[PDB]
Copies of this chain bind each other. A is one copy, B any other.
Amino acid sequence: KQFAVIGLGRFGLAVCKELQDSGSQVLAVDINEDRVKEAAGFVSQAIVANCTHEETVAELKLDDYDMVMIAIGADVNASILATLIAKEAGVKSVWVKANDRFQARVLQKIGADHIIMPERDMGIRVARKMLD
């Protein structure tokens, strides 16, 4: 029912668009004000914040959210540190988007419940679409 999306790039904005269209509460958070404004029309609440900051994550009651999506791709350290801070905050399920295999390995060892690699996973999906 209630979801949080951290990082509002192309991937995260798509997650927010689908989640809200399905009829759920989505807290969209991105350090960049332009993307938060872009996603403000779609999501229930759009907040400009740095999720690498521990006190900001404490203030945003992410432990109350059923699922938290971390969609930071460019800076691997940002995604790893956001995952660590979210896990320390008490978030039970953390979904993290990873662009590289080393990042996926690190995130798996940290404790992310779901690691999403968009290029490989769509590779498999479109291969299955081509087969049938």
- Residue numbers of A with Cβ under 8 A of B are 1, 3, 9-19, 22, 24, 52, 67, 69, 71, 73, 76-78, 80-81, 84-85, 88, 95, 97, 100, 102-103, 105-106, 109-111, 114, 116-131
Number of copies: 8
| Pairwise interchain contact A131-B24, C-beta atoms closer than 8 A | yes
Q: Is the interface of A mostly helix, strand, loop or mixed?
A: helix
Cα–Cα distance between A19 and B127 once the two chains are bound (Å): 6
The answer to whether B127 touches A15 (Cβ under 8 A) is yes
Q: Chain B residues near A78 (CB, 8 Å)?
A: 102
Interface centre among A81, A110, A127 (most CB of B within 10 A): A127
Tell me the smallest distance from the CB of A91 to a CB of chain B, in Å: 13
